[PDB]
Structure formats: structure tokens, C-alpha cells
Design a binder for this molecule. Structure first.
Ligand SMILES: *[C@@H]1O[C@H](CO)[C@@H](O[C@@H]2O[C@H](CO)[C@@H](O)[C@H](O)[C@H]2NC(C)=O)[C@H](O)[C@H]1NC(C)=O
Ligand SMILES: *[C@@H]1O[C@H](CO)[C@@H](O)[C@H](O)[C@H]1NC(C)=O
Ligand SMILES: *[C@@H]1O[C@H](CO)[C@@H](O)[C@H](O)[C@H]1NC(C)=O
Lengths: 625, 13
């Protein structure tokens, strides 16, 4: 009996059995004191004969497929200090007789199929330390009051269960409890004030419930408190200033609640705060200067609130800041230059605010910044030339501001830049040919600007998926170079001064799902090649130009087209070439010179009558029976 | 498993 995995007692009989990761299967010495069969891929029920070893202090069945209920006689072993049934399929209620185990220290039921309530008998276990039952979706009911009687409790977690109701005031009694995890559950009601009575509490995870009332002030008296995750609940009221009295607290998440009030000035006292998340609340006030005393702060997410004022200039005092999101507030003044002294900033989102003045150039001196999102503010000035200094810029959105002048040619310095949106501004001049040097640029939106001059195919990086130049002053002709953007998908040139023929090389853009040429000076006949992208699916808008001739025959090949608008042109002839397009959803042929009959299909009887009326000869016909 | 504790996932425009 010297076999590996077996331990004999000093009186010679078998004491311990140990097996792990042996890839077994199926179902599964009255002195044996510890039994571990774990990672064995066993199935079926726990044999009710498990009670036949009356000497067991430890039963570890964890990480198998084992099924059925938990044999109640497993609770007839009163020397058991450890029970791990976790990571199995066991179903059933938790037996009341569990209270009969005086010596149970660690109890692990988690990641099972279990259901029912938690027996009120857990309070009979006076030496219980870790209770982890979470990851049972049907384990439910209120948390029993008697839970306050487990005096030595250290870890409680019920996370990802159906557990509901209010945490009982009983929790005042666990004076050694370090971690309470009940998260993504059915909990409701207010956090009980009496939780301020757990002195040893370190981490509180109540996130993703519906928890009402307000955050109890008494949480400030928790001297050892470290992590607070309250996010996605109903929490109302002001953030308690007493949280500043919790020295070890490096993490606070109140995101997505109803809170009101000011971000507390006492937060300055918090020397260890790495992450502060308040997003989606009703919080008001200015950002307090004392929060800049927060040296270890990496993430500050204050977005989606009522915060007012100017961004504090002392923000330079936080040298470890990575992510700063203030979007959807009411913030005034300049983006302070001194924000560029946070050398570790990866991401800034100041979008949806009132910020004014120019964008300080020093921000583009940030070497690790992949995201600058300033969209929707009152921003004015030029885009600094220093924009090429920003090596890692990936996502850039300046849209919805007043920024003036030309787009600096340095932006072609940026080799990682995937996404730029400068739409809805005052920008002028030509689009700088230097942008052709953005190797990575897939999405470019310049729409609603004052841009002018002549487009060029040599001006565009070949990797572009998406281009919107609409609503500008752009003139002359669409270049044949357009045939070189083979990955292009949406292309919108609408509302410009563009003219001439449509170049036939558009047919060599093989990826195109959307083409909007609407409202320009284009003329000539719509080329035969336009029907040659089988890819055109989403939309084709040729409206409001000078096009003449007949709708081209190859058009019947656009079998995936769902929207076509040819309105306000000089086009003539019939629509017969359009009568086989079954996926055609929206068609605007109005204000043209078309004539001839349309079938009585439910499609064409949907076309407005004024639509047909703006043409030369259009009318619905009736087929000869 | 049931997932380890986490912060609300951050959102930007
Ligand atoms: C972007 O890069 C340029 C080029 O290295 C930086 O600047 C020059 O700046 C230095 C120091 O301020 C001056 O001594 C030179 O006269 C400048 N040279 C030229 C030709 O302008 C610039 O500071 C960087 N910008 C940012 C915001 O980091
Ligand atoms: C086509 O372009 C014109 C002019 O820009 C626009 O007003 C119209 O809405 C567009 N057609 C569709 C399908 O919306
Ligand atoms: C033509 O019809 C479409 C769909 O009804 C409409 O949205 C569009 O505005 C019309 N085109 C123009 C140029 O008005």
C-alpha cells in the first residue's frame, strides 16, 4: 500500500486517497481520512455510500461531470472540515442537515446546476470560513438571516445566482469577513447600514443587481476597504464623503446608477486610488482640484453625467493616468495644455461637451495615445501640425466642432491611423496629398466642411474601406484613380461641385456596397460599367445631377441593389431594365424624362403618383389576359 | 465558469 497517491496513517491503514487529471469516466478501509477524486471526468450520481467512510475530514470531488442530488448522508460526516463539490453538474436543494457539520471550514459548491434556497442551517456552522456557492443560476431566495451566525466567515460569494431580496442586517455580525461577492444576481433593496460593522471587509461586489436606496455612509468606517464595485444598480443619492477615510481603497465603480451630488473633495485623501468609475449617473459639480492628488490613478471615467466647469489644470499631477473619459457632461473652457504631461495617456474622450478654444498642440506629443475623441464641442482654431508627432494615434474623431483652416500634411506621418472623422467643421483648402502616406487608414469622413479643389486617386491610401466627402465645395472630375481603391465599400461624394462623366474604372472597385454621387454637376450618360459591381447592395444615389441618356442595360445585373435613386436628372427611355430586380426595395425615378409602361406588380403601384407625374410618359399598365 | 469580478466595461465614442 505504498502506491503513489496513497498516504498511510501512522497506525498503518489507508489514510488519504489522491487523484488528479487522470482522464477517467463513468460513475465512481473505514479509516480513510481524506478523499480527493478531482479532474477525473466522472459522471452520474455521488454514491450514497460516501457516508461509509466515517473518518473523512476532507472530501474533494471538484471538477468532474458528476450529477444528480447531493446524497444527504454526505452530511452525516461530522469530522469533515472541507467539502468541494464545485465545477460539477450536481442539482437539488442544499440540504438543511448541512447545519449538522460542526467542523466544516471550507465549503465549495460553485459552478453547478444546483437550485432551491439556502438552508437557514448555515448559521449552525460556527467554524465556516469560505462559503462559495455562486455560478448556480437557480439558487434563489433571500440570503438567510442566520448567515450572521457564521462568526469566522472570511469569504462569501453567491455571484451569478438568482439570490434575491435584501442583504440582511445580520451582516453586521461577521467581523472577520474579507470578501463579499454577490454580483449579477437578483438582489434588491438598500445595502444595509450594518455592513459598516464588518471591520475586516476588503472587497464588496454587488454589481449588476437592482439595489435601491443610497450608498450607506458607514462604509467609510471600513478601514481595510479596497475594492467597491456597485455598478448597474438603482443606487440613488450622494456619494459619501467618508469614502475618503479608506486609505487602502484603490478601486471604486459606481458606474450606471442614479447618483446625485458632487464628486467628494475627500477623494484627494485617497493615496492608492488607481481607478475611479462614475459613468452614467446624475452627478453634478465641477471636477474637484483635490482629485489631482490621486497620484496612482490610471482610469478616471466620469463620463455621462452633469459635471460642469473647466478641466482642472493640475491634471498634470497624475502621471500614471491612462484612460480619461469625460464625455456627455457640460464642461467649459479650454482643454488645458497641461493634460499632455500625463505621458501614459492611451485614451481621451472629451466628446459631447461645451469645451472651447483650440486643441492644445502638446496633446499630439503623446507617444502612447491611440484614441483622441473630441467630437461634438465648441472647438475652434487650426488642427495643429504637431498632429504627425502622435505616433500611435489609431482612432481620431474631431467631428462636430468649428475647427478652421486646411488639414496639415503631417497627418500622413501617422502610420497606425485607422479611423479619422473631421466631419462637420469649418475646414478649407484641398485634401493634402500627403494623406496618401497613411498606410493603415480604412475610414475617412470629411463631410460637411468647406473643403475645395480637385480630388485625386493618387491622394488616397489604397486601404480605405469608407470615404465620405459629402457636403463640401469639391470640384472638377472624379478621378480614374478611384479604380485603385479596391477595398472601398461606402463612397459618398454627395453635395459637391463635381462634374464630367463618371469614369468607367469605377467598375474595378470590386468591394463597393454604397455609392452616393447625389447633388453634383455630373453629366454624360451613366456608363455601362456602373452595373458591374455585383457588390452594390446597400445604395446607389445618382440623383440631382445632369445625367442624360437611358438607364444602362447592365443595371439589371445589380441584383443585390436595395435602394436606387436617379431623381432629378435628364434621363429618358423606359424602366423595363429595372423590372427584374427582385431585391429592389426603394426606387426614386421622379423628375426625369422617362416614358412607357410599368407592370402592375405591388412594387410599382407603391411608387407615388406625383413621382410618375414629374416624368414625360410614365403610367402603370395592365397585362393582356 | 461564472466570470471573475469585473468593472463596468468602458465606453467611448
Ligand atoms: C512635434 O515635433 C517637432 C519636431 O521635432 C517639435 O519641434 C520643434 O520644436 C523644438 C522644441 O520645441 C524647437 O526647438 C524647434 O525649433 C522646432 N522645429 C521645427 C522645425 O518646428 C515639436 O515641439 C513637436 N510638437 C509637439 C506638440 O510635441
Ligand atoms: C440622394 O441624394 C440627394 C441629394 O444629396 C438626397 O437629398 C436624397 O435623399 C438621396 N436619396 C436617398 C435614397 O436618400
Ligand atoms: C427619392 O426617394 C427616396 C425614397 O423615397 C427619398 O428618401 C429621397 O429623398 C428621394 N430623392 C430626392 C433627391 O429627393
Amino acid at each position: 500500500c505504498n502506491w503513489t497517491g496513497v498516504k498511510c496513517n501512522r497506525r498503518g491503514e489507508v489514510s488519504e486517497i489522491q487523484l488528479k487529471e487522470k482522464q477517467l469516466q463513468g460513475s465512481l478501509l473505514k479509516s480513510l481520512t481524506s478523499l480527493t477524486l478531482s479532474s477525473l471526468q466522472l459522471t452520474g450520481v455521488i454514491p450514497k455510500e460516501i457516508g461509509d467512510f466515517t473518518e473523512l475530514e476532507l472530501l474533494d470531488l471538484s471538477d468532474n461531470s458528476l450529477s444528480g442530488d447531493i446524497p444527504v448522508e454526505i452530511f452525516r460526516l461530522k469530522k469533515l472540515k472541507t467539502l468541494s463539490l464545485n465545477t460539477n453538474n450536481l442539482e437539488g436543494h442544499i440540504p438543511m442537515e448541512i447545519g449538522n457539520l460542526s467542523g466544516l471550514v471550507e465549503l465549495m459548491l460553485f459552478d453547478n446546476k444546483l437550485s432551491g434556497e439556502i438552508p437557514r442551517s448555515i448559521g449552525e456552522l460556527k467554524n465556516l470560513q469560505v462559503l462559495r456557492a455562486g455560478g448556480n443560476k437557480n439558487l434563489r431566495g433571500e440570503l438567510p438571516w442566520e448567515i450572521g451566525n457564521c462568526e469566522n466567515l472570511v469569504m462569501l460569494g453567491l455571484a451569478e445566482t438568482s439570490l434575491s431580496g435584501k442583504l440582511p442586517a445580520s451582516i453586521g455580525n461577521l467581523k472577520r469577513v474579507q470578501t463579499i461577492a454577490i454580483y449579477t444576481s437578483l438582489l434588491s433593496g438598500p445595502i444595509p447600514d450594518e455592513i459598516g460593522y464588518c471591520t475586516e471587509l476588503q472587497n464588496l461586489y454587488l454589481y449588476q443587481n437592482s439595489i435601491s436606496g443610497s450608498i450607506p455612509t458607514t462604509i467609510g468606517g471600513l478601514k481595510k476597504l479596497q475594492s467597491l464595485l456597485l455598478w448597474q444598480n438603482n443606487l440613488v443619492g450622494k456619494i459619501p464623503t467618508e469614502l475618503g477615510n479608506c486609505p487602502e481603497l484603490w478601486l471604486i465603480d459606481f458606474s450606471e446608477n442614479l447618483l446625485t451630488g458632487t464628486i467628494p473633495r475627500s477623494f484627494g485623501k485617497l493615496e492608492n486610488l488607481q481607478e475611479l468609475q462614475l459613468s452614467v449617473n446624475q452627478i453634478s459639480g465641477t471636477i474637484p482640484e483635490e482629485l489631482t492628488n490621486c497620484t496612482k490613478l490610471t482610469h478616471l471615467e466620469i463620463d455621462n453625467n452633469l459635471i460642469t466647469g473647466e478641466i482642472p489644470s493640475l491634471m498634470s499631477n497624475l502621471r500614471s493616468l491612462t484612460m480619461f473619459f469625460a464625455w456627455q457632461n457640460k464642461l467649459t473652457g479650454n482643454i488645458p495644455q497641461s493634460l499632455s504631461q500625463c505621458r501614459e495617456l492611451q485614451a481621451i474622450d472629451l466628446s459631447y461637451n461645451s469645451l472651447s478654444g483650440s486643441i492644445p498642440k502638446e496633446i499630439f506629443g503623446l507617444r502612447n495615445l491611440t484614441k483622441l475623441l473630441l467630437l461634438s464641442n465648441d472647438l475652434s482654431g487650426f488642427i495643429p501640425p504637431d498632429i504627425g508627432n502622435c505616433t500611435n494615434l489609431y482612432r481620431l474623431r474631431l467631428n462636430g466642432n468649428r475647427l478652421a483652416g486646411s488639414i496639415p500634411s503631417e497627418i500622413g506621418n501617422l502610420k497606425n491611423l485607422n479611423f479619422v472623422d473631421i466631419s462637420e467643421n469649418r475646414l478649407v483648402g484641398s485634401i493634402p496629398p500627403a494623406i496618401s502616406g497613411c498606410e493603415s487608414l480604412e475610414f475617412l469622413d470629411l463631410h460637411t466642411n468647406s473643403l475645395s479643389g480637385s480630388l485625386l486617386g493618387t491622394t488616397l491610401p489604397k486601404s480605405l474601406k469608407f470615404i465620405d466627402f459629402s457636403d463640401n465645395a469639391l470640384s472638377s472630375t472624379l478621378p480614374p484613380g478611384i479604380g485603385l481603391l479596391t477595398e472601398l465599400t461606402k463612397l459618398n461624394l454627395a453635395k459637391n461641385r463635381l462634374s464630367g462623366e463618371i469614369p468607367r474604372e469605377i467598375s474595378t472597385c470590386r468591394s463597393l456596397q454604397l455609392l452616393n454621387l447625389g447633388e453634383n454637376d455630373f453629366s454624360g450618360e451613366i456608363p455601362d460599367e456602373l452595373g458591374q459591381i455585383p457588390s452594390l447592395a446597400i445604395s446607389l444615389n445618382l440623383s440631382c445631377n445632369r445625367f442624360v441618356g437611358e438607364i444602362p442595360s447592365r443595371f439589371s445585373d445589380l441584383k443585390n441593389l436595395g435602394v436606387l435613386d436617379v431623381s432629378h436628372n435628364q434621363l429618358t427611355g423606359n424602366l423595363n431594365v429595372l423590372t427584374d430586380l427582385q431585391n429592389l426595395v426603394s426606387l426614386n425615378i421622379s423628375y426625369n424624362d422617362f416614358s412607357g409602361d410599368l407592370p402592375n406588380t405591388p412594387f410599382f403601384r407603391r411608387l407615388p403618383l406625383s413621382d410618375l407625374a414629374s416624368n414625360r410618359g410614365l403610367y402603370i399598365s395592365n397585362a393582356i389576359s | 465558469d461564472y466570470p471573475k469580478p469585473s468593472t463596468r466595461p468602458p465606453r467611448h465614442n
